[PDB]
Amino acid sequence: NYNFNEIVDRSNNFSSKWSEMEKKYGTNDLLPMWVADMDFKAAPCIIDSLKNRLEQEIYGYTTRPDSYNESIVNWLYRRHNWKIKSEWLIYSPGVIPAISLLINELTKANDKIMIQEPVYSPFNSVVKNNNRELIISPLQKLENGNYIMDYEDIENKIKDVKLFILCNPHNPVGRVWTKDELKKLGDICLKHNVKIISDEIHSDIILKKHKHIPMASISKEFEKNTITCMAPTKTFNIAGLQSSYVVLPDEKDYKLLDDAFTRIDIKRNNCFSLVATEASYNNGESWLESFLEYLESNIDFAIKYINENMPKLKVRKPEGTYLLWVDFSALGLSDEELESILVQKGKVALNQGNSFGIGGSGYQRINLACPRSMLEEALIRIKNAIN
Amino acid sequence: NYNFNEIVDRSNNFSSKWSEMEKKYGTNDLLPMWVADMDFKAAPCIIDSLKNRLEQEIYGYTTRPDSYNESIVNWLYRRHNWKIKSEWLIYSPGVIPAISLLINELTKANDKIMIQEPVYSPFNSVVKNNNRELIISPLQKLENGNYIMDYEDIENKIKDVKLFILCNPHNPVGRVWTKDELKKLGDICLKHNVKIISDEIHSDIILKKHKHIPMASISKEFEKNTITCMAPTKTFNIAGLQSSYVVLPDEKDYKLLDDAFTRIDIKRNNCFSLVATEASYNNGESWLESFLEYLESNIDFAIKYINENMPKLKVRKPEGTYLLWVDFSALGLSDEELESILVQKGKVALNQGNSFGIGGSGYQRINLACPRSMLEEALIRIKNAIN
Ligand SMILES: *Cc1c(COP(=O)(O)O)cnc(C)c1O
Ligand SMILES: *Cc1c(COP(=O)(O)O)cnc(C)c1O
Ligand SMILES: [Cl-]
Ligand SMILES: [Cl-]
Ligand SMILES: [Cl-]
Ligand SMILES: [Cl-]
Ligand SMILES: [Mg+2]
Ligand SMILES: [Mg+2]
Ligand SMILES: [Mg+2]
Ligand SMILES: [Mg+2]
Ligand SMILES: [Mg+2]
Ligand SMILES: [Mg+2]
Ligand SMILES: [Mg+2]
Ligand SMILES: [Mg+2]
Ligand SMILES: [Mg+2]
């Protein structure tokens, strides 16, 4: 037991979630339920690792000890049944930096790169900002409200594509893809000699009855065709420490990314990231399991509240991530109108669905990694906004 | 007064200086006097800013409050008499990453970039790793042992150059360029429409009777032709925190670098870098002044020791930086022989002059930002090596 009910003031915590809404929504005087970090304290093991490193009193250039990558190897093996080699790992300050460099190195200007919308908006922008062409294969929104891949669409568009960027679990719709769904996609990509970059940052935030399957874990051929991005940051609420890794089982790919990070001279973890990453994987599993029980309770509470109190809204329980994807289309409001009522009448900040691209219109994304009290206040504000 | 004589054992401090010699020198069992970080504890104000941040116990995405760039603006004004606008500042995790992106955006493949050797080795590799053409204008080593710029050579090689990368103060030779030296260089570059990137990371480490002059501060004409990189990291020994900034008074340059950082999605300080940077500039001046007295004492001690005890070596007192550039050529040993006898017999790890490019042969670089006891030991081991 860790006390996830505890409310922590973040008004003095140099938090973008609490302090950068003015830019985006027009004011900071809103209840923030938008950007994906949590309103929970880091695991005690993380905090103590930071304290111990702080007490050294010298903060020079940091070497990466073998125990760091060993912690990552062991995490992936015991949590995801995927045994990797330490030699396959590259440090990156974040997932999107790594994907950016990978796009620059693995493709030529104007090459086609495929994603599936609605999705995390940096997928769309990182392609365009690198002067490659973005090809969107929208997820299919079924008449039952759920989302699946559009395999027929992918096969129709795949012929001149060079890379496919997968979100697994998929933010914002909350899908934890099954082995069979991943096998179908992976076989298509292999048939067409398309490499997959799998963004698996949400890999540890998986609800009951679901299991994360790394795309690269399915078979040795999928392993060699997949470059995987993961991090401790979403799992343990340590984005402010900046730490991620890339698993590249193909040495040609490894060399290209290693050379790219040499080119921009980004090689070392900061000193706190170093210790917190190792501490989170070696010692954070008990906190994580407790977090996932608390999160599932928040999810169930939120869905029940919505279905009882805002019955015009439609919501499907996510299989993973701590983000809820809620359909407001029955209100008959344009996306701008919906944002305006939520901000001005509700005083609540949710992520606008349209920001995730095709299939986002009419939706809003709500962050449930917060104390129940804060979640309830958010739901009350939404109820007031739409009434 | 601060206790610079205190030895801080860095064996458990995940320090690259103490733990990465095996790669470069064959063995970890050497006294490290190479990589430029200090063997001193951080200023109290830094340690405590980190502790107070740590005790908030939430490490999510970090906003940059106005106070952070205000600290930088105020520092540049009161320390260097250079009044900048906060709107000119772009965050970078380091100086070389910023220069790398600057090179990619301000020039085309195979364009010419000029540097002055011997110089910090990333200046050479950042140009070549970006597939630009490197035009070296060696510094002129005078028969009195000092270094000046080779203006004739610059004028002869500059006609087709796009960018000039200036080191001010110049690592490793320790020059603090005078206003007149900088004016002469700047005018040559302006005549030929050559933009100057000025790496001024050593700007605060300035010895008595010398004064740092930002190239961009000389005039408005110079300001619009100059892009400046600075950081708290060398000053305050916080390279493990990762923080630097770029001053771009030209809005077109600002937009190109802003867009580059958007492309690789590196925008936010880590949470600890944020608080330490502001604390160092708002509260660290007293520590800095004390450090500069201790450093100058160490320099005077080392030069006296060398001239008395290793009289075939030649050394000139640095005007800036904490790095001592010592000529071993009178021993009649090759660079290879020299390196062997220092590592294997002295058991001392110095930076080999040849790593700094043209004009480095015969030289070794020693880091003097350590307790006197450690400096004495290094000098004793160098003496033992060459006897
Ligand atoms: C939050 C998030 C990230 C974070 O990216 P960084 O560049 O590591 O900050 C990456 N991918 C997805 C799908 C996310 O939701
Ligand atoms: C130490 C040093 C740097 C540091 O580079 P970062 O990329 O900030 O680590 C840059 N320039 C010079 C001249 C240096 O001596
Ligand atoms: Cl379904
Ligand atoms: Cl309703
Ligand atoms: Cl002489
Ligand atoms: Cl001698
Ligand atoms: Mg301790
Ligand atoms: Mg097959
Ligand atoms: Mg397997
Ligand atoms: Mg209903
Ligand atoms: Mg406090
Ligand atoms: Mg702000
Ligand atoms: Mg010209
Ligand atoms: Mg002599
Ligand atoms: Mg003595």
XYZ file of N, CA, C and O and ligand atoms in Angstrom, chain A residues 80-83 179 216-220 223, ligand 9:
45
model
N 7.649 -8.764 -19.374
C 7.111 -8.936 -20.739
C 7.530 -10.189 -21.408
O 7.164 -10.397 -22.557
N 8.207 -11.076 -20.684
C 8.724 -12.348 -21.254
C 9.531 -12.159 -22.537
O 9.525 -12.995 -23.434
N 10.301 -11.093 -22.588
C 11.075 -10.765 -23.779
C 12.513 -10.603 -23.355
O 12.814 -9.680 -22.581
N 13.385 -11.505 -23.772
C 14.784 -11.489 -23.387
C 15.591 -10.807 -24.445
O 15.650 -11.308 -25.571
N -1.697 -10.518 -29.438
C -0.693 -11.187 -30.226
C -1.174 -11.393 -31.654
O -0.451 -11.128 -32.620
N 8.269 -6.945 -30.980
C 9.541 -7.635 -31.226
C 9.623 -8.976 -30.493
O 10.445 -9.795 -30.818
N 8.748 -9.223 -29.520
C 8.790 -10.479 -28.719
C 8.087 -11.641 -29.385
O 8.214 -12.792 -28.947
N 7.335 -11.382 -30.476
C 6.467 -12.409 -31.038
C 7.244 -13.545 -31.738
O 6.856 -14.721 -31.610
N 8.369 -13.215 -32.350
C 9.212 -14.157 -33.031
C 10.543 -13.524 -33.335
O 10.664 -12.315 -33.249
N 11.524 -14.354 -33.710
C 12.859 -13.845 -33.992
C 12.801 -12.990 -35.245
O 13.504 -12.007 -35.306
N 11.474 -9.662 -34.193
C 12.540 -9.016 -33.436
C 13.487 -8.261 -34.344
O 13.778 -7.114 -34.127
Mg 8.831 -14.410 -27.641
